Structures are given as C-alpha cells and as structure tokens.
C-alpha cells in the first residue's frame, strides 16, 4: 500500500499506545496530589481520549506538573495523528483528480 495509508495506520496504533500509556502515567503522576481526580485507570483512559481529540469537557484534568506534561504529550499525539489522516485523505484525493484529468 501507499505511504500515506501505511503512515495513517501506524499513527493510529501509536495513538492507541499513547492513550494507554498516558492513562497509566496520569494516575501515577496524580495520586499523591490532594484534590486530584485523575486517579483511577478507567476514567483516566476516558480522560486521555477526550484530551487527544481535544474535546476537553473539563470533567477530568491533571493538577500536577508531571500529569500536565503527560497531558501535553497526549494532546500533541492526538492532534498530529488526526492531522496525518487528513493529509493522507488529501493525497488520495489529489491522486484521483490527477487521474481524472488524464495527467
């Protein structure tokens, strides 16, 4: 398959890894901080997803330095991964239009 499709698949796998790792690390970073809510794994996984998609409801978020650092990694991974899917779609469309034009 073409590069853009391979890259998209890879990006998806990497994002899943980051969501899982981010959830584990977020709990690790936040427990020990009075008042923190990102402290159990199931909801931390949910938090990682709404952060990677940049939805950010505000129901859960990190209060510590390391939790916030983990958060930035999750954000960047989500933004870049979805952006890469967009880039792959554009490449697919560009190629199809070239053909349709007989170029």
């Amino acid at each position, epitope marked *: 398959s073409a590069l853009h499709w391979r890259a998209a698949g890879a990006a998806t796998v990497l994002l899943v890894i980051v969501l899982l790792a981010g959830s584990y690390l977020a709990v690790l970073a936040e427990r020990g901080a009075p008042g923190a*809510q990102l402290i159990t794994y199931p909801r931390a996984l949910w938090w990682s997803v709404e952060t990677a998609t940049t939805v950010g409801y505000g129901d859960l978020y990190p209060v510590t330095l390391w939790g916030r650092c983990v958060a930035v990694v999750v954000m960047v991974a989500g933004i870049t991964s979805f952006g890469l899917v967009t880039a792959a779609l554009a490449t697919w469309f560009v190629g199809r239009e070239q053909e349709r034009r007989g170029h």
Partner: antibody, heavy 118, light 108 residues
Framework: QVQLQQPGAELVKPGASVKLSCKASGYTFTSDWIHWVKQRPGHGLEWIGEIIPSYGRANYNEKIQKKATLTADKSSSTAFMQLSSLTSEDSAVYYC???????????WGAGTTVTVSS | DILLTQSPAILSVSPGERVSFSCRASQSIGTDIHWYQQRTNGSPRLLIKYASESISGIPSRFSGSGSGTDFTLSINSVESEDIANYYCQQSNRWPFTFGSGTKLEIKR
C-alpha cells in the same frame, strides 16, 4: 486461596521500629496498588498510604504524622511497611489491602496486631 | 480532603426489618462510594461498589443507592449475621477517605 497474607502480631519496644509484610497471591496486574490501613481497638479505619508495585511509587496520608515507609518486592510479590520510632499511640491492627486501580479495596489481609510495650 | 459523615453511629432494628445506613460526603463525589462490613474481630469485607454495584458472594439482601453527596446502604430483612460495623469509603478525590462507621444492633 488467601490473597493477602500478613503476620498475626508484632511486639515493639517504644522508640524502636518494625517492618510489616504482606505477601500477595492470585491475579496480579501492573495497575495494582497495595494500601495500608490502621485501626485502633474500638475505633475506625484510617488510611496510611499506598504503593504501586509495578513502579515503586508510594503516597502517604498528609493529615497524620508519617511513621511509615512503603516498599515492595516484585519477585516475592511482597509489600512492606516500615513503622519507625513507635509509641503506644502506634499500637493497633494494621491491614494491607489490594486495589485494582479502580478505587475500592476488593480484598484485605487478616491484619497484623502491633503492640508497642516494654 | 473529603469528609464522609456516617450518622447515626448506631442503628437499632428488629429482626427481619429493613435498615438503611447513611453516608454524606462534604462535596459531590458522583457515585464513587464503596461500602464495607466488618464483624467483631474480622477484617473489612467489600459489600457494594460504586454506590450501587453488587459484589459476587454478597447476599441479595444488600443494596446501595445515591449519588452526589448523599448515599445509602440498605439491608432488606436484617438477620443476626448482619450485626457488624459498616463503613463507607470514597475514591473520587485523592486521598481516599473512610467514614467513621455505623454499628448495626438488633432488638430481639
């Protein structure tokens, strides 16, 4: 079978210290946290602290004087709590409990009755 | 730190009657409350998780309800084996905390 095994009792001279143990069996996951809870005779349950074996990180109750130090041995699947410079105020039953990272203590040890006396 | 208030501290009920234990949290904690039973000379035993979720091995007699700041542990038709101390515990915010406990007494 018993998931958490703790010694029945420990006698400690005032000022001295002791190391309590909690041997765990059954399913074990990287998300497991081992907690320690203190209970004075006739009184309620007081959270002491927690440790995550898969990483070695430990957190403690900030409201009370820190008497404990938590450690864990992955190979022997054993968690330890070092209580130091104890006084009669430290005499109590100390329970270890297992939490699967989801907030509740699914299982508890039988508890170790610690007595601080000469 | 979240304060869990369990009042009254002692509940007196007659055999077979329905009883309800109260646990009030100092702030809203959704349904992140769990209940434990501790009989004389025994270790705590998980009865209900996340305010209303059943635990395998626990008599259907036990149920839980509530969300926010007010929670209830109910026993339908109490019997002798239910005599013990009952504690609530929250896991919504760090650190986890326990209520002061309520003792169940039976009037026979």
């Amino acid at each position: 079978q018993v998931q958490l095994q703790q010694p029945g009792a420990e006698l400690v001279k005032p000022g001295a210290s002791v190391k309590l143990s909690c041997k765990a069996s059954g399913y074990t996951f990287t998300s497991d946290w081992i907690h320690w809870v203190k209970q004075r005779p006739g009184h309620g349950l007081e959270w002491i602290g927690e440790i995550i074996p898969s990483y070695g990180r430990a957190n403690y109750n900030e409201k009370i004087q820190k008497k404990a130090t938590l450690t864990a041995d992955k190979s022997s699947s054993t968690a330890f709590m070092q209580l130091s410079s104890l006084t009669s105020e430290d005499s109590a039953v100390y329970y270890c409990a297992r939490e699967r990272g989801d907030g509740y203590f699914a299982v508890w040890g039988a508890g170790t009755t610690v007595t601080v006396s000469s | 730190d979240i304060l869990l208030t369990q009042s009254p501290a002692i509940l007196s009920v007659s055999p077979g009657e329905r009883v309800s234990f109260s646990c009030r949290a100092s702030q809203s904690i959704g349904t992140d409350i769990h209940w434990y039973q501790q009989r004389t000379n025994g270790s705590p035993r998980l009865l209900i998780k996340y305010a209303s979720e059943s635990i395998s091995g626990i008599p259907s007699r036990f149920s839980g309800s509530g969300s926010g700041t007010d929670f209830t542990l109910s026993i339908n038709s109490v019997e002798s084996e239910d005599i013990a101390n009952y504690y609530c515990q929250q896991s919504n915010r760090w650190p986890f905390t326990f209520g002061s406990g309520t003792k169940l007494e039976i009037k026979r």
